[model samples]
Target chain A: FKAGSAKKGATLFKTRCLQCHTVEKGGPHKVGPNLHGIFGRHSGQAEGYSYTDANIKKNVLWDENNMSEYLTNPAKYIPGCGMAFGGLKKEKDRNDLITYLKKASE
Target chain B: FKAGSAKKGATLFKTRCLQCHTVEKGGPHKVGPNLHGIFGRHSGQAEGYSYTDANIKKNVLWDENNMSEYLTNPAKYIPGCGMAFGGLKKEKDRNDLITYLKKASE
Candidate 1:
C-alpha cells in the first residue's frame, strides 16, 4: 500500500515493533520472538524459541492475510495469545509495518 | 515531504530520470549528467563531464530549491539547459524525486 512504503514502514516498525520483535542484524529479542523470515514461515518456529500452546495448536502460517489480521487486533485473532502489546489501529500503518517487516527479513 | 518519500522517489527517478542521470552504482550516464551527489554540490562540475555554455555561465548550485525549480521546468530555469526532457508537472513528484536523488547520492 502507498506504493510499497518499505522505508516508511522501517521507521514505523522501529518506533512500534522494536519493543517486541528483532528483525535487524544483531538486534535483540524483547518480549516476542525474533521476526527473522517471519513472512511465509510457520508461526512459533524460530530456532530454540519457545512457543505458547495456542501458537502451536493453531498451526498458523505467517502469511500476508494472517499478519494483517493478527496485527490489526492480536487478541481478537488469537485469543489468549501471549502477545500483550495493543494492536495497531491504523490499517495503513499495519500494512506498511508488515511491508517493512517483510523487507527487513529479506 | 510526506515524511521523506525516498523509496517512491527512487522508483519515480528510475522511471523518469534514468535516461539522463546515473546515481546508482554500475549505472550508465545518458543524455545529460551523472547525478551522484548533485545535491549541495556545484552544478556543471561532474569530474569528467562537459557543461553547456549557459550552465557554466549561470554557476548555479544544486541545492534543494534549485533542483525543485529546475525539475519543475528545466527549460524555464535554464533556457539552454541541455536536458530536453520535459519538466515534471507534479510538485510532490518533483520533491520526492529530489529526495530520492539526495539519498542515492549518499
Candidate 2:
C-alpha cells in the first residue's frame, strides 16, 4: 500500500470506525473488537469478544493489503463476518484509515 | 421434523419471513430471495437474486431439519447471509413457518 497521512486517517477513524472499534491498547471492545496491535494478528482472536463464525473461521493474517480489502467491504471480504458497516468506498479514504490504524493500533 | 399446521404457519410467515421472502412459485424477489421450491433445493440458487458468498458456498440441500436450524438463527447458520432477521426463536414457530413454506411454494 502507498503511504497516506496518518493525521488525515485519524479523522476518518473518528468518524467511521470509532463507533465500533478502539485502537488503544487494552481498550474495551465495543460493537466490534478492539483493534490494538491488529497488524500481523489473525482475525477474531480478541479475548472476551464473541465473534461470528465467519470471522473466526476465515482467519487471515492482518496486513496492509488484507486490511485494505477488509475495510473496503467487510461482509464481502469474509462472507459471514458480522461487522455491520457498509465499508469505505474511496481508495484514498481506505489508505488514510489504514495509515491511522497502523499508527494507533501499535 | 414433526408436522406443523400450515394454516398456523401462514400467519407466522406474514409476521416473520414475509418481509423479505416470497414463497410463491414465481414470486418476485424482495430483500431476500423468493423461496419457491426451496425444499430439496440448495441454498442461494434463486435466479437473478444476488446472494452472499457464504450462502452460495455453504450450500446445503434445504430440508426440514436444516431449514429448522436456519430459521432458529440465520446469521449463526450461514454467518454472512444477508437476511437482516434475528430468526424465529421457538421450535413451534419454525415448524409452522416451514410447514407453510412447503405448502405455499409447491
Candidate 3:
C-alpha cells in the first residue's frame, strides 16, 4: 500500500463517503454515523445511531482486520447491516481507503 | 512542489479542465483546444484551430513560466481570448496543476 494511494483515498472518501460519514471536528452524521475516532472504536457504538440487530450481535470492534473485511464486503460481514453500499471490491482500494479513514479519524 | 499535490491536480483537471482540453491519444478538441504534446508546443499551433490575435501576438511556447502565468489568470494573460473561466488563484495550485499537465501530456 503506497502512501500516495492513501492520499488518493482521502479524495475518494470526500467524493464517496463524506455524503454519509464525518470524521472532522464538529462534523455531522448523515446517512451513516459520525465516524470521529472510529479507527479503534467498538462497532454499534457511534453515539446515537441505531445499529441493526446483526451489527449488535456481531459485537465487533473496528480493528484492522474487521475494518478491512467490512470495507471489502460489508453485507457479507454482517448481513442486513444498515450500510447499504456494496463495498469496494478491489483489495488495493480497501487498503487505501482504510489508511485514509485511520488518518481522518485520528 | 509536493508530488502528492500534482496527483491531486490530476483529479482537479479531470473535474475542471478535461471538458476543454485533451492530452490523451485520439482525444478531440472541445470548445477550447486539444492539448496533446502541449507542454513544449508553441501556443496557437494546435492543428486546425483559429488562434485569436492576442494569443498569436504573444508567440509563446508552453514552458513552465508561460503555462504558469496563463493558468494563474487566463483572461489577464490574453485579453479577449476564448477561454471563459476565471483561472485558479493559488500559486501552489498552479505549480501542482502544471506538474500534472506535464505528466499527462508525456
Candidate 4:
C-alpha cells in the first residue's frame, strides 16, 4: 500500500487500463464501460452499458478489497464478464491502480 | 453466409459486442477500441489501443475472410489480444455480424 503512488498511477492507468476504460468524469464509454464513479457500485450495473449474463448473475459489490481482487485477475473474479483485462500480476501495480482509480473515480 | 442480416446484426452486436465495443464513429474507446472504421484496418492497430504482442505480431489485415475468422475465435485469431469476447458460435450470427459490421463500418 505504501509503495503505491497516485503520481505514477496515471501512467500505469494509461498503459494498462486506458485501452478499455474511461476514468475521467463525463468520459465517453469506450470498449469497456465508463468507470467514472465505480467505487460504491455493484458489478454489472453501469447504466446503458451491456454486461454479460455471467456478470449480471455474479452480483459483486465493489470496495478497494474486492476491486483489487477483481483486477488481480478479471476472469477469475467474475467469470464470463466482458471485461477483458487479464490481470495486474503485481500487488504493487494493484496498489497504485487502486490509488489511481480512487482518485479519478472519487 | 447468405442468410446474414444487418438488421438482425444490430441486435446481435448489441447483445454480444456492445459490452466491449462501440461501433459509432467518433465513439469513445471502451473496453476495446471503437469499430467505426475497422473494416479495412488490421488487427491490433487501433491507434491508442494497447494491443497484445501476439496480435501486433500476427499483423492480420482485416477482410471478409479474416475478420470472419477472427470473430469465430478472437484469442485464436490473435492469441493474447486483450479482447475478451470468446467466439460467435453460430454460423448465422457470424454471417449477420459480418453484414452488420460491413454496413456500420463502411
Candidate 5:
C-alpha cells in the first residue's frame, strides 16, 4: 500500500473510528476503549473500560502490524473480540489512520 | 420503601453501577453514559455515548419517579433500552442508589 497522509487520516479517523473511540488524552471512553496513547499501551487494558475476556487474555501489546490486522478484520483476527467495528478494509486508509494516531497520541 | 443509607448505597453503587457509570464531573463515559448531572438531563443526550434510538426518543426529563421506574426495569420501561443492566429489583436499593447519585453529582 502507498504511504498514507496524516492530513487525510484526520477525517478518516473522525468518520470511521470516532463513533466509538476517542483520540483525545482526556476524552471519554465510549463503547470502545480510548485510543489515546493506544500505540504504546496494552490492548484491552484501558483503565476504566470493560474488555471481553478474550481480549484481556490475548495480552498483546499495540504495534502497527497488530493494529492494522485488527483494524482490517477484528472478529476474524481475534474471534469473540468485543469491539463492533466492521473492519477498515482499505489498507491505505488504515495506514493513514495509524499514522494519525501515532502523531495524535503524542 | 424505607429510606436508604447513602453509606450503604455507596457500596451498592460501586458493585452494581460503577462498572459502567462514572458519577464524577469530567469522568469518562464508559459502557454507559457519564452520569454526572443525570438528575437534570434528558434520558439520552449525553455528549458522546451512543444511546439507542428508543432512549433518545424517550423525551423524559430525569426525576426521582421516572429514574426509579427506569432503573427498576430498563428494558421494560424503555422497551428498547440499550443499557444492559437488569432491573434493580429492590425498591430500597433504587431509593438508596438515587440518593447516592444525587449527592455524588453535587
Candidate 6:
C-alpha cells in the first residue's frame, strides 16, 4: 500500500486501537501489547505484555506486509491468538492505522 | 446466592465461559486463565496465566458472592480486566455459572 496519511491514521487509532494499546515508548500494555517501537519487534515480545501462547509461538517480525495481513485478520494470522478484535476489512483503513502506528510508536 | 444446579451450570459454561477458560486440572490458559481449582484461590494466582495488572493487584479470594459480582460485570468488578466478555445480566445465569465453576474447577 502507498504511504498512508498519519493525520487520518491518528483519528482511526483513537477510535479503533487506543483502548487496547499505547504507542509511546515505555507505555504500559493494555489488553494488547504496547505498540511502541512495534515495527521491527517480534510478535509477543513486548517487555511486560501478557501474550497468548499462540502469539508467542507464532513469532514474526512486524513490518508493513505482515502487519497488513495481521490487521486484516488477527486470529487467522495467528490461530488462537488472544486479541478480541474482529479483522479490519478495508485496505485503506489498514494502511492508515499502520502508518499511524509506525509514527506514534517510534 | 442459592446453591445452583451444576448440571445446568455446565451448559452455561459451554455456551458462555468455555471459549476463554478451562476448568480441568492442568488445562492450558486460553485468553483467560485456566480456572482449575479456582475456589478459595486468590485472584490472578493461576500458576501460568498471565494476568492484567489490575487483576493481580485486586487480589481477592474466589467465593460465591464475589464471583457472582464479578460475573455480573468483570470490568466493573475489577477495572481494566482484560476479559472482553460483556457481563452476564441475569442473576440466574450468574448463579448457574458460579455453581458450574465451583464444581468443575475442583
On DockQ, the leading prediction is 5
Angstrom error at residue A62, model 4: 16
Task: Report the C-alpha lDDT of model 4 over B1-106, residue by residue, as the tens digit.
Answer: 4647899988888888776677877564444567788877777766544454566548678877777676786442222233355568777878888899888876
For candidate 4, give fnat to 2 decimals: 0.19
TM-score of model number 3:
0.43
Candidate 4 scores an iRMS of 6.4
Between prediction 1 and prediction 6, the one with superior TM-score is 6
Q: Is the docking of candidate 3 incorrect, acceptable, medium or high quality?
A: incorrect
Tens digit of lDDT per residue, candidate 1, span B15-34?
A: 77664456854333333445
lDDT of 1 by residue, A1-106 (tens): 3335888888888776664466864343333456787775788665434444475446687787777777786342211122344467788878788888888987
Q: Give the per-residue lDDT digits (tens) of candidate 5, residues B24-95.
A: 886766556688888778878766555545655586898888878877863322111232453588788888
Q: Write the residue-wise lDDT of candidate 2 on A23-102 in tens digits.
A: 88877554356788888578877654445456554777888998888778643322223345537878998898899899
Q: Rank the candidates by TM-score, best first.
A: 5, 4, 6, 2, 3, 1
Q: What are the chain A TM-scores of the candidates, in order? A: 0.77, 0.85, 0.77, 0.80, 0.81, 0.83
Tens-digit lDDT string for candidate 6 (A1-106): 6788988889988877676566888765444556788887788777644454565558898888888887786332212233355356789988888888888998
lDDT of each: 0.62, 0.70, 0.62, 0.67, 0.69, 0.69
**Which ranges in model 2 have alpha carbons more than 4 Å from their true place?**
A1-106, B53-56, B74-83
Number of the top candidate by lDDT?
2
True contacts kept of each: 0.00, 0.00, 0.00, 0.19, 0.25, 0.00
Report the Cα RMSD per candidate: 19.8, 14.5, 20.1, 6.6, 5.9, 7.2
Off by over 4 Å in 4: A1-106, B1-3, B74-85
Which segments of candidate 3 are over 4 A away from where they belong?
A1-106, B1-4, B74-83
User: Poorest 10 consecutive residues of model 4 chain A by lDDT?
Assistant: A74-83
